[PDB]
Design an enzyme around this catalytic site. Structure first.
Site, short mmCIF file in Angstrom:
data_model
loop_
_atom_site.label_atom_id
_atom_site.label_comp_id
_atom_site.label_asym_id
_atom_site.label_seq_id
_atom_site.Cartn_x
_atom_site.Cartn_y
_atom_site.Cartn_z
N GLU A 87 -6.29 8.21 -1.75
CA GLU A 87 -6.41 7.03 -0.90
C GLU A 87 -7.41 6.07 -1.51
O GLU A 87 -7.23 4.85 -1.43
CB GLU A 87 -6.84 7.36 0.53
CG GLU A 87 -5.91 8.33 1.25
CD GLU A 87 -4.55 7.77 1.61
OE1 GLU A 87 -4.25 6.58 1.34
OE2 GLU A 87 -3.77 8.57 2.17
N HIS B 101 0.84 -1.18 0.00
CA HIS B 101 0.00 0.00 0.00
C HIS B 101 0.90 1.27 0.00
O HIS B 101 0.69 2.13 -0.80
CB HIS B 101 -0.92 -0.03 1.22
CG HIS B 101 -1.82 1.15 1.33
ND1 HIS B 101 -3.13 1.14 0.89
CD2 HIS B 101 -1.57 2.41 1.76
CE1 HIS B 101 -3.66 2.33 1.11
NE2 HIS B 101 -2.74 3.12 1.63
N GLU B 102 1.92 1.31 0.86
CA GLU B 102 2.84 2.46 0.86
C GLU B 102 3.66 2.53 -0.45
O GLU B 102 3.92 3.60 -0.98
CB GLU B 102 3.78 2.40 2.09
CG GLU B 102 3.03 2.58 3.40
CD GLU B 102 2.04 3.77 3.38
OE1 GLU B 102 2.48 4.93 3.18
OE2 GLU B 102 0.82 3.57 3.62
N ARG C 37 -9.51 -5.29 4.27
CA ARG C 37 -10.65 -4.50 4.69
C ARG C 37 -11.60 -4.21 3.53
O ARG C 37 -11.22 -4.21 2.36
CB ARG C 37 -10.15 -3.17 5.30
CG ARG C 37 -9.30 -2.42 4.33
CD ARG C 37 -8.69 -1.11 4.90
NE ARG C 37 -7.61 -0.62 4.04
CZ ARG C 37 -6.98 0.55 4.21
NH1 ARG C 37 -7.34 1.37 5.20
NH2 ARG C 37 -5.98 0.93 3.39
N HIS D 252 1.84 4.47 -3.16
CA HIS D 252 2.04 5.92 -2.99
C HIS D 252 3.43 6.37 -3.54
O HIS D 252 3.55 7.43 -4.11
CB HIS D 252 1.95 6.34 -1.52
CG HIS D 252 0.57 6.28 -0.92
ND1 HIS D 252 -0.53 6.87 -1.50
CD2 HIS D 252 0.14 5.77 0.25
CE1 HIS D 252 -1.59 6.69 -0.73
NE2 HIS D 252 -1.21 6.02 0.35
#
Ligand SMILES: [Ca+2]
Ligand SMILES: [Zn+2]
Ligand SMILES: [Zn+2]
Lengths: 425, 429
Positions: free
Chosen positions: B264, B226-227, B363, B230
């Site tokens: 996001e 996820h990072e 999630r 970015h």
């Protein structure tokens, strides 16, 4: 082309595929079944102590009895499910380690593909025979019904001595106490290994003198080499020798089967006299010639199998020539290459390929023994590098555990703990 | 073609290759160097707490501030060499996990290959500019010589809150306090990540069969990915902080407090993409297109460099990176069809898709409630967490039972009170 290593927990339910209850060889009469895990195609692990044919009192020898021994004893090893699972995860890690480099990938591909011939000295030549303990075993499905399955290798935990690893073949006994040993006669058989990854010995070598602990994956590969000989039916127990020139590193005790020196390889190969190397070579050639002759006669089977598919398989396994009339025979050049391929798998060469330090030769002194508590900890031991992580690869510092035994004992007494090894009582 | 993941121990000596001292961006005036570890080509790890620009009192907040917060604080995390080494080994394990499947291999190849443009809004168009903190840094070699080096990403340990991971770009200031942010303007820049693999949150999900709720701990490899998504946006100069939105309908799984940057939701992917309004999606697309057209124009002007680099090789590299057209006279321009495919590729990397590819449960969406937080004490133990499967070893893969840590915080808290220990998670104070 590289094999697949499967993962499982000890408590995972039976699934009639990678986790089944099996009746291992020699348990036919007692009819005893064990939970087993298929780590890779044709290889099963039973993470319990090996107990067959063994006096139970040997698992817990008295203190007076213990001291003489080089070995180590603990009856409680593998007594809990938690520890059986720990044993399983380690075995999964060592197979992944072997499968991390081409040289080890090739070895596992052989362990998978070199299936025993469907027959032996005491079975019908015209028949592919599947229904005896050298080639198959009973398994108990989830619904409780029994079916038969073929495989190449069954690995157990240790017997009484936690430091002893050993390999063996299976005997066929049709009647009147007769004994065929197809793993010594070119056919091959299902093989057995007793293996104990968490108990290890160290060796000595001079840079300065120091002790180095052995990498369990290399120890396992050493046993898989014996297995490979069994599967190709070139396995020996005799041809025992002592070296002609005793070097300072050697600890010579009794004559030792030539197979140990061929299995270590490198310079140990020359310890085996030329006369014996030629005997072994010619014996295997005669056995493969016999198998080719018999393969030309096969027209039926003891099971619902594809006969032509199995014939193609044995053509490739034994590298037979097939002439324009479909007749199999031994081609001497392909045989020479096959014999070389079989004996190309050695501890010496595999240690070099894996950048693992090992002993000077088979007769080198063993030191210890040691318990290795954290093989599953990747900050200590990895699939890719073993103990020699990062700059610890330089001079194999990752395996270096101290100058000598006494020095180690003082430190452990003073309370200095290692997370790599613990010196055993 | 898949990248190589390097191994090292914190105490390994400097070797002018995978282990050197580096002077990271913003440490130029103080001239401060840190021991750094090149986990893969162009990615360095400094396994220390992130402290730059941060009031030191924040590392140890008082009972008053601390109790309210969803986070976790401990000033002593990563204070010893032993714990820095542990951090390094976990990071090695997480990069090997990412590199164990094709979808993650492709992500790491992008992180390696999307080097920043050698220039920005406030540098000369005719020049490949290497000599500022957005594209290179000082490193100190084994013999003590100081040289300049380029890279794409530097990863640090956490700041004050051990549960907060965050990504950021680097700012250029030529003169007069001016600020260029090339990682937002198509050029890209060196990226920074603060990452904390041992502290995690859980999410909730209701089983379709049992009709019962359960908490699932997050896989740190997916959290790192996820990072990295970015970072990837920053390397391609598409990074945003504004374009903030709230959802149309607050669904029961969501916990919404303030507007959140559209990035996001694009990073999560899946159904979260539809939360971002069509007009904003078109604005971002047209902004990037306009920035890449400017870079094509500027690349036609380059005839010199501030260092001894091979100019034509870097031009080939940016031709490929930005998927520019090149005509028979050597003139670069934007091809609209190649741009659409590039933009699609950049935004193809999502938490939702990588979770599916890795068979990791995640999630329901970015706005999902976080639970915990948790300490993960045994990521290094292959009987708990593996490179190839994460927590979901063997039959634990069924219904992601390997990530299932209990029914809710209440039950978990009670069990931990009773002395029932988990080797997967520990609920934090
Ligand atoms: Ca591992
Ligand atoms: Zn041997
Ligand atoms: Zn994000």
């Amino acid at each position: 082309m590289p094999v697949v290593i499967n993962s499982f927990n000890y408590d995972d339910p039976v699934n009639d595929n990678t986790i089944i209850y099996i009746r291992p060889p020699y348990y036919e009469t007692s009819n005893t079944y064990f939970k087993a895990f298929q780590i890779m195609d044709n290889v099963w692990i039973i993470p319990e102590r090996y107990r067959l044919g063994i006096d139970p009192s040997l698992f817990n020898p008295p203190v007076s009895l213990k001291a003489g021994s080089d070995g180590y004893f603990d009856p409680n090893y593998l007594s809990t499910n938690t520890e059986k699972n720990k044993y399983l995860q380690i075995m999964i890690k060592l197979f992944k380690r072997i499968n991390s480099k081409p040289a080890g990938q090739i070895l596992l591909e052989e362990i998978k593909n070199a299936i025993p011939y469907l027959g032996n000295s005491y079975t019908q030549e015209e028949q592919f025979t599947t229904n005896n303990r050298t080639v198959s075993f009973n398994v108990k499905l989830a619904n409780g019904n029994i079916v038969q399955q073929m495989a190449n290798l069954i690995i157990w935990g240790p017997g009484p001595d936690l430091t002893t690893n050993k390999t063996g073949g299976i005997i066929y006994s049709p009647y009147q106490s007769m004994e065929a040993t197809p793993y010594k006669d070119g056919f091959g058989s299902i093989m057995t290994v007793e293996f104990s990854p968490e108990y290890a010995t160290a060796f000595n070598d001079i840079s300065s003198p120091s002790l180095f602990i052995k990498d369990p994956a290399l120890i396992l590969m050493h046993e898989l080499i014996h297995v490979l000989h069994g599967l190709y039916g070139t396995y020996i127990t005799e041809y025992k020798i002592t070296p002609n020139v005793v070097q300072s590193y050697m600890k010579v005790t009794k004559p030792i089967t030539s197979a140990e020196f061929l299995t270590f390889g490198g310079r140990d190969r020359n310890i085996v006299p030329q006369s014996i190397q030629s005997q072994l070579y010619n014996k295997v050639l005669s056995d493969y010639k016999r198998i080719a002759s018999r393969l030309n006669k096969v027209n039926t089977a003891t099971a619902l199998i594809n006969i032509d598919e199995f014939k193609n398989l044995y053509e490739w396994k034994y590298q037979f020539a097939k002439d324009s009339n479909g007749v199999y025979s031994v081609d001497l050049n392909k045989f020479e290459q096959l014999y070389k391929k079989i004996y190309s798998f050695t501890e010496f060469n595999l240690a070099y390929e894996f950048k693992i330090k090992t002993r000077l030769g088979y007769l080198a002194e063993n030191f210890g023994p040691f318990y290795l508590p954290n093989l599953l900890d990747d900050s200590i031991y990895t699939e890719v590098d073993g103990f020699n992580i990062g700059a610890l690869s330089i001079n194999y510092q990752g395996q270096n555990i101290g100058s000598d035994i006494n020095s180690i004992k003082k430190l452990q007494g003073q309370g200095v703990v290692s997370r790599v090894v613990r010196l055993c009582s």
